[PDB]
Design a protein around this nucleic acid. Structure first.
Ligand SMILES: Nc1ncnc2c1ncn2[C@@H]1O[C@@H]2COP(=O)(O)O[C@H]2[C@H]1O
Ligand SMILES: Nc1ncnc2c1ncn2[C@@H]1O[C@@H]2COP(=O)(O)O[C@H]2[C@H]1O
Ligand SMILES: Nc1ncnc2c1ncn2[C@@H]1O[C@@H]2COP(=O)(O)O[C@H]2[C@H]1O
Ligand SMILES: Nc1ncnc2c1ncn2[C@@H]1O[C@@H]2COP(=O)(O)O[C@H]2[C@H]1O
Lengths: 200, 200
DNA sequence: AAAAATGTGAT
DNA sequence: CTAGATCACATTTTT
DNA sequence: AAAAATGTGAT
DNA sequence: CTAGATCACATTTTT
């Protein structure tokens, strides 16, 4: 679409390599990111330093927006690159202007925040409402049904560690494994190493 | 401020009585609400029908916005009146126009969604990261330090059932009580009926 | 009058 | 090791 | 070479 | 009654 590239045309593009960190939690916020390609993980931590993945984001997504509507906003979470990334960046100040000349961009952003509020709210329910098994199961279905999931005679195949699965559903790595083994004993999946086949 | 009343001047005001329901979950969304006075609770439910309070909202807050950026959006949660309310209402369609003539209103809304995303994300951490006691404690401190909390020689006094406390932190009513009694045994609070005094 | 909100105490 | 959920009336509290 | 990610099995 | 967390190496897997 036009408008997207007018905005882009006003951003510095940057690349980050997998595992690097685009946004530092609690730092002062003055920039807005747009992921042109690649994948990132928004994550929060606890005192011990244990992590909690609040969400993933991909091509198309805006990052670093929450601290865009009030002076002295600090970053709410850390943003790490899931994969190699190309991210458009633009100053808050600069961006603000674009809006004035074009209120569509601001609308498009807000839609994304709107969508996010739903997922996070949904995720709040999930924890309050489902057990780890239940949560883990759901996570395997979503992943398994994504663009990156792979094809497999018996269903769809995903690749991920029991560590990162635990930081998505909010449980310990040991608990993921005990449950992954139970899900296999129930013939729902087959898991070898980081590879897991969700049957279908 | 000016702009607020220009917007208001384009809304039908309505009153709802405590316990009534302003928004029906899953219904088609076409209206946007603005709370002119009173308090509401955004809540989600599970199959059993058990509730989970995602948040409270008060004078100043917008409601019914998530389903404002895409055709055929359905309400994400139920909205019930905590207290007697006066809520400005305006069609999505109508509202959209105001924005065009004035992009400040749309900005002001987005700020609120932004703020919300933070609290909900924070709330996600809270569950993933704290135990009920920990969660309950935090809830008593927030409530206790609000405009409605009451004054008391020993600290601040709040009034609320162990039922609604459980639907905020996400635990059972029985568990709230066991913990409220433990918090008293630790001399942190004093609880008689719905009344609780958080010491200070 | 009943509903509404709580409490056991065990398990 | 041990935090929560669940149970099903009799007992308080509200509307 | 080590880090990184896992697994026990008990409790 | 019973779902999770925690523990601290020896054992796989990566970078
Ligand atoms: N709950 C969430 N869901 C999705 N993205 C989020 C969430 N919380 C934070 N983010 C993103 O992570 C960023 C962290 O810093 P910012 O507050 O600048 O902006 C935040 C968003 O871009
Ligand atoms: N309540 C929680 N308890 C334990 N780990 C958690 C929790 N919430 C999120 N996590 C994270 O999820 C991760 C799962 O694998 P780890 O045990 O390596 O580390 C865990 C933490 O980083
Ligand atoms: N997590 C949340 N935090 C705050 N308010 C919310 C949240 N989820 C939903 N709401 C409000 O509740 C409304 C439910 O219907 P809508 O999707 O129209 O718009 C939603 C918001 O106004
Ligand atoms: N995981 C959960 N288990 C039980 N109740 C929950 C949960 N998450 C939210 N809730 C709600 O919190 C309420 C606490 O009091 P109740 O037992 O009356 O009913 C409970 C549910 O409506």
């Amino acid at each position: 679409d036009p408008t997207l590239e007018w905005f882009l045309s006003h951003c510095h593009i940057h690349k980050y390599p997998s595992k690097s960190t685009l946004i530092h939690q609690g730092e002062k916020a003055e920039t807005l990111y747009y992921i042109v390609k690649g994948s990132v993980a928004v994550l929060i931590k606890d005192e011990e330093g244990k992590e909690m993945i609040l969400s993933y984001l991909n091509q198309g997504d805006f990052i670093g927006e929450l601290g865009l509507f009030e002076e002295g906003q600090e970053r709410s979470a850390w943003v790490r690159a899931k994969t190699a990334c190309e991210v458009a960046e633009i100053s808050y100040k600069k961006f603000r202007q674009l809006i004035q000349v074009n209120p569509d961009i601001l609308m498009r952003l807000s839609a994304q925040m709107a969508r996010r509020l739903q997922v996070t709210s949904e995720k709040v329910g999930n924890l309050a409402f489902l057990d780890v098994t239940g949560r883990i199961a759901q996570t395997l279905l979503n992943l398994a049904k994504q663009p990156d999931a792979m094809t497999h005679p018996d269903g769809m195949q995903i690749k991920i560690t029991r560590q990162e699965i635990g930081q998505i559903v909010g449980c310990s790595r040991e608990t993921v494994g005990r449950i992954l083994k139970m899900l296999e004993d129930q013939n729902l999946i087959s898991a070898h190493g980081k590879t897991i086949v969700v049957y279908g």
